[PDB]
Design a protein around this ligand. Structure first.
Ligand SMILES: [Mg+2]
Ligand SMILES: [Mg+2]
Ligand SMILES: [Mg+2]
Ligand SMILES: [Mg+2]
Ligand SMILES: [Mg+2]
Ligand SMILES: [Mg+2]
Ligand SMILES: [Mg+2]
Ligand SMILES: [Mg+2]
Ligand SMILES: [Mg+2]
Ligand SMILES: [Mg+2]
Ligand SMILES: [Mg+2]
Ligand SMILES: [Mg+2]
Ligand SMILES: [Mg+2]
Ligand SMILES: [Mg+2]
Ligand SMILES: [Mg+2]
Ligand SMILES: [Mg+2]
Ligand SMILES: [Mg+2]
Ligand SMILES: [Mg+2]
Ligand SMILES: [Mg+2]
Ligand SMILES: [Mg+2]
Ligand SMILES: [Mg+2]
Ligand SMILES: [Mg+2]
Ligand SMILES: [Mg+2]
Lengths: 139, 175, 201, 190
RNA sequence: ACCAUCUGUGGGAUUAUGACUGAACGCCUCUAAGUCAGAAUCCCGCCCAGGCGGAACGAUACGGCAGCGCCGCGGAGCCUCGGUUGGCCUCGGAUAGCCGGUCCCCCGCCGGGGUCCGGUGCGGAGUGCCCUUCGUCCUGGGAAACGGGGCGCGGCCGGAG
RNA sequence: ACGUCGCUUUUUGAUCCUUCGAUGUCGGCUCUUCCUAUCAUUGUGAAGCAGAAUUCACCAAGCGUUGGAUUGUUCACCCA
RNA sequence: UGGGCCACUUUUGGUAAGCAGAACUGGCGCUGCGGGAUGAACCGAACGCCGGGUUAAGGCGCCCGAUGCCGACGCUCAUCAGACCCCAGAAAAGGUGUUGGUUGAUAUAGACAGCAGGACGGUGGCCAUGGAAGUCGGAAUCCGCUAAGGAGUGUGUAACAACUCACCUGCCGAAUCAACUAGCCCUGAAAAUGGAUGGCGCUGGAGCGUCGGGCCCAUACCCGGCCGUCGCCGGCAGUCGA
RNA sequence: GCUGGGAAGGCCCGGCGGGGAAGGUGGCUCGGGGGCCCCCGAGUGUUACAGCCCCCCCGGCAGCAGCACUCGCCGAAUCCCGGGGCCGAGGGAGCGAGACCCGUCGCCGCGCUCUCCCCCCUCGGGGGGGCCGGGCCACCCCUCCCACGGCGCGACCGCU
């Protein structure tokens, strides 16, 4: 039933801690609780990291266990993990949450007006569709 | 002695010079201590038992923190220790995996406290050695020597239980 | 909050939920806990039943009519636990206790509402999967609660009604998505405005 | 000590179709359907092959207590396979010293009446578990055949009969009356 | 007045205990997960009392000015008690998994199965959604025009915990 | 058995903390409730348990545990 | 005033005592305040009346101020669990519950466990006797066949017989066994009104061991205001606009 | 600022190599899942179609307790800015004119003027550059003493 597995090369996304919000690559595994983790292209130098702050993504990189950061970066840049991660819906959701939080009062005003008009249009269309499906009478 | 995140100290000491012997020998010890003060205290405690030396009748010529040589290399530590249980004294040998020798020793103190109710003053470290995976003996460590190690995290308990404290959606554990 | 906070008692640990609710009612909030028979208790059922039987044995020897009133209904049991967590012998404590409403099953005033869930109290995250736990409904029924049957049937009927309502809600969302597909051209600019500021990925 | 993984595999015979609805295993075969959910055990059940049809039970980070549930689940599934392929037949030999035991099979073998156990007037009435059929033998003198698909239910019915036939206030080493399960086997012996 | 006569009752979860399947520990095993039988015990029933606890229902103040109920937001007001400062009108649930959508089979034109397709650190997301108040007057482009509002009348349906 | 570790406060001691500007001090009768370290009864396991009778132990205190001669007696013994 | 009492350590009588008597220091008495739910003596700290800040001991699920930390590592399931000096309850002895540790041993020349074979001859060995043929006992402990078989580990017979094990081999393929030890838990573990980690309750911990960051308040500490006292036997007769 | 004049680390495919092993790369053998070609699992090993550790003949470059949050102790080797809260006790400080409209006063820290040229804004008012010599340090040379540390070379004394 499991689809994501901690292993050598799995790309993890850090949720909290000093390195929160960055992608990293699992290099090695220790004691069921920590992993030697090193994300070179994402500005995380090699260090141990608990599994609790990791959220595995669907990307797996190919390199030997405990290889050096040179080879980790080589694999990462050949895979273009930055662009693929940007393409995924997870990072899109995170970006949208961030840009929703950073909204100013004027942007909130514009959002209110646009959403008001958009919901008016959509609701009117829904009423039309309900009429179309309501004009049926045949047992 | 209490704990924290232990740091290893090389402590070099000697007896004070006497007319009998103007060049008393120097002795080195590795003390895993919270700070240099406790390192010196534990050094004097240990050399009092090992040799006929005293803090007052001797002096410490050096007390320096030993940085980890390879803090990015996962490695296996075997710790020979002896400790005072509630009903005697026993020697133990334990296995750990850590990026630092001092971290392995801190793990040893925590593990002895959890498993044997032993305090840091009872525990008495007498050897810490980096050993090979083939030389490992405890299965809890031996099961991590696999180039194709792979496991999922089955039951991710939500740790942000109070943020939000009230919500309409029941949490999902599978991830 | 000034509104009435409604909690769905299914799957919540008894003490874990009562501790939150006591603070809430002390802070001037109105709390309504429904479906109190679905509250779990950690530890195995026979142990929990033994604990409640001991509470049953605790009574005033001289006159049991004055002694500890052992309330049998699950809602009353949860209410008593909340009372034990509250300073009920003062006026403020009595007001806080009166701000709370407890129910076995879900009455009509609340069965047409949205029910909140407290993650910090849920059995799923406050119990390891290997531990045994007991249902307040079974425990109360076996210690004297006489209405496990009627409540079960009424709850199943409410489940059927809410299922029909949910079916209609699904139909409404299907129509809403179809209407968005219809007026994509008309609302394309407002969609851009929403997207730039992060609503509607 | 949390072992990283403990896994065990069971081969499915060709004429048996096993479906996984979560942790609910549905085993279908020539003798019918056996259904059982293992929702009280947190495991990873998966079906692997296309011709072999292997079924793997995985348990990650299992300590000593739950490491033993893997073989339990595999054995229960193999019991389901055995039940839907060959069925379970428990042969019980009713032994008595003096008083013969009158065993009467009522409606469609779901009710067993023990009449003259130790020569008394009370008639024991035992209702077999659903889907379990009782019979009085023809090749044997005092023998009962209990046939079914769920081994749990079949053996529980056999135990019901055996514990209905119980001696009281007597030296049980002397009074050896009762019905005891002589052997446990299958139908069709395949 | 046992100094006469009459009446005195059912179920459930289970204790001890005996078993089932089945590992741990390629054998065994009543136990570890999951099951079974089970008692002057326990709990309820039957029996007694009936909450500063509720229900349904009835009648509801004169032969003289005399009371009252309901309808009007009908008006004018007095006295007294204060809180609050948008709403959310709802599947069932699982957590070693979920949710949404579609083509075939059943049961009366919809639901349930199976195939297929999607999403899943839940975006068909409560970290969410809906409404969003300065008001008018010229005055155009868009949405609309199958629309909006009636403390507007009359009718139908549904909701019983 | 020789030893050894406990529990209880239904015995008798040890002490004198409370009460001497007073807590009515033995026993019996009456009457209620509680404990179990269970005598009987329910369900059980065991025996040098064939049956009967008996012996040990378990869950267990719901119900019962009597009439009299002597004695102020509690205790003691007997008759039934 | 000349009745003292309590606590750490030392210490005498006593089975012991919230008993009786000594030494040192502190305290209570004579003392309030924070904490130990509660408490003469324990922990902190001693006090004029207030404001701000910060601590002590102790805590931070709710009662009840504060962990509503995305705390760390492990241990533990109790059908009488556990939960903090004084302290308000327990022992020896056990456990194939689980964990850690020590020591020893067997093993791809095939472990261990299961299923399956063999389990012999001198010799029904000597005394012992009523019968003791391996198995009631007193002594001896050898040999050959062997792959191995003990003049025997048990069950059994009056003795035999017949089963069983030591011991060898087959099938099986990869690790396995035993003896100790100390952590939690369980047994050991029984009293009277109904009742007590303070209660509620708590089992991805609100339990136990070892640690981190925060945070909470005492009459304590710092700063400031005010009152009074004490001290400087302080200053002022110079009102000397000349 | 100091440390091991920090430890590791990043780049220069680090180049010349050596040695080693597995948590064993590729390949090869075996047994399996996909229509004689791919994936999975068990053995061999020394680099192969991945890599890891140790030694160098030596490294070089940025950075340096890192504004890529890996692991310290501090500030004569330490400064600047901002926010929140509580507070306003005291009441004749003038040696000066001989006070008189009234102690904007003591100590401490500064600015301008009683000298003059200019520069840049502003319609007289603002912002700046100084204005002549001294030393001492930094640069070059060569130059003394002392303290400390290490290394070599002796004379004496003592320990064989
Ligand atoms: Mg089997
Ligand atoms: Mg008998
Ligand atoms: Mg009568
Ligand atoms: Mg049992
Ligand atoms: Mg049953
Ligand atoms: Mg006295
Ligand atoms: Mg008096
Ligand atoms: Mg009196
Ligand atoms: Mg009296
Ligand atoms: Mg008893
Ligand atoms: Mg009674
Ligand atoms: Mg004394
Ligand atoms: Mg005295
Ligand atoms: Mg005093
Ligand atoms: Mg004091
Ligand atoms: Mg106090
Ligand atoms: Mg206390
Ligand atoms: Mg204060
Ligand atoms: Mg407290
Ligand atoms: Mg609070
Ligand atoms: Mg105990
Ligand atoms: Mg810096
Ligand atoms: Mg003032």
């Amino acid at each position: 039933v499991f689809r994501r597995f901690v292993e050598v090369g799995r790309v993890a996304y850090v949720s909290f801690g000093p390195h929160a919000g960055k992608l990293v690559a699992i290099v090695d595994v220790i004691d069921q609780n920590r992993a030697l983790v090193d994300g070179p292209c994402t500005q995380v130098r090699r260090q141990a990291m608990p599994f609790k702050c990791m959220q595995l993504t669907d990307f797996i990189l190919k390199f030997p266990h405990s290889a050096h950061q040179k080879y980790v970066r080589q694999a990462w840049q050949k895979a273009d993990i930055n662009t693929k991660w940007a393409a995924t819906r997870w990072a899109k959701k995170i970006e949208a949450r961030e840009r929703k939080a950073k909204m100013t009062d004027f942007d909130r005003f514009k959002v209110m007006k646009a959403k008001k008009m958009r919901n008016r249009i959509i609701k009117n269309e829904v009423k039309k569709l309900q009429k179309a499906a309501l004009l049926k009478a045949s047992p | 002695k209490a704990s924290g995140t232990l740091r290893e100290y090389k402590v070099v000491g000697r007896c004070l010079p006497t007319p009998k012997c103007h060049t008393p020998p120097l002795y080195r010890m590795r003390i895993f201590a919270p700070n240099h003060v406790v390192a010196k205290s534990r050094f004097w405690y240990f050399v009092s038992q090992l040799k006929k030396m005293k803090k007052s009748s001797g002096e410490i010529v050096y007390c320096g923190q030993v940085f980890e040589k390879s803090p990015l290399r996962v490695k296996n530590f075997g710790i020979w220790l002896r400790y005072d249980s509630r009903s005697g004294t026993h020697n133990m040998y334990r296995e750990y995996r850590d990026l630092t020798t001092a971290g392995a020793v801190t793990q040893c103190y925590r593990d002895m406290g959890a498993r044997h109710r032993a305090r840091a003053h009872s525990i008495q470290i007498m050897k810490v050695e980096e050993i090979a995976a083939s030389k490992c003996r405890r299965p809890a460590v031996k099961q991590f020597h696999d180039s194709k190690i792979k496991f999922p995290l089955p039951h991710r308990v939500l740790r942000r239980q109070h943020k939000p404290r009230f919500t309409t959606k029941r949490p999902n554990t599978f991830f | 909050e000034v509104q009435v906070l409604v909690l769905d008692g299914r799957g919540h640990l008894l003490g874990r939920l009562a501790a939150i609710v006591a603070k809430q009612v002390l802070l001037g909030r109105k709390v309504v806990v429904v479906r109190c028979e679905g509250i779990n208790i950690s530890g195995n059922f026979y142990r929990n039943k033994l604990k409640y039987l001991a509470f049953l044995r605790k009574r005033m020897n001289t006159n049991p009519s004055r002694g500890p009133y052992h309330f049998r209904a699950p809602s009353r049991i949860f209410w008593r636990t909340v009372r034990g967590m509250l300073p009920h012998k003062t006026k403020r404590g009595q007001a806080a206790l009166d701000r709370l409403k407890v129910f076995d099953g879900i009455p009509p005033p609340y069965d047409k509402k949205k029910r909140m869930v407290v993650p910090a109290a849920l059995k799923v995250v406050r119990l390891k999967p290997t531990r045994k736990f007991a249902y307040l409904g079974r425990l109360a029924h076996e210690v004297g609660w006489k209405y496990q049957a009627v409540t079960a049937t009424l709850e199943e009927k409410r489940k059927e009604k809410a299922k029909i309502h949910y079916r209609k809600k699904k139909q409404l969302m299907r129509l809403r998505k179809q209407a968005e597909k219809n007026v994509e051209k008309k609302i394309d600019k407002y969609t851009e405005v929403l997207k730039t500021h992060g609503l509607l990925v | 000590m949390k072992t990283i993984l403990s896994n065990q595999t069971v081969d499915i015979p060709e004429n048996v179709d096993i479906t996984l609805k979560g942790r609910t295993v549905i085993v279908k075969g020539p003798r019918g359907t056996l259904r059982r959910d293992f929702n009280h055990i947190n495991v990873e059940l998966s079906l692997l092959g296309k011709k072999k049809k292997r079924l793997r039970v995985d348990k990650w980070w299992g300590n000593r207590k739950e490491l033993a549930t893997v073989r339990t689940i595999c054995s229960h599934v193999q019991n389901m396979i055995k039940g839907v392929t060959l069925g379970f037949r428990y042969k019980m030999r009713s032994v008595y010293a003096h008083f013969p035991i009158n065993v009467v099979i009522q409606e469609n073998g779901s009710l067993v009446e023990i009449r003259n156990f130790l020569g008394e007037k009370y008639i024991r009435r035992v209702r077999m578990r659903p889907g379990v059929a009782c019979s009085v033998s023809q090749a044997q003198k005092d023998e009962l055949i209990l046939e079914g698909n769920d081994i749990e239910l079949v053996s529980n019915s056999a135990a019901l009969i055996q514990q209905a036939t119980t001696v009281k206030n007597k030296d049980i080493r002397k009074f050896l009356d009762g019905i005891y399960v002589s052997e446990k086997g299958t139908v069709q012996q395949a």
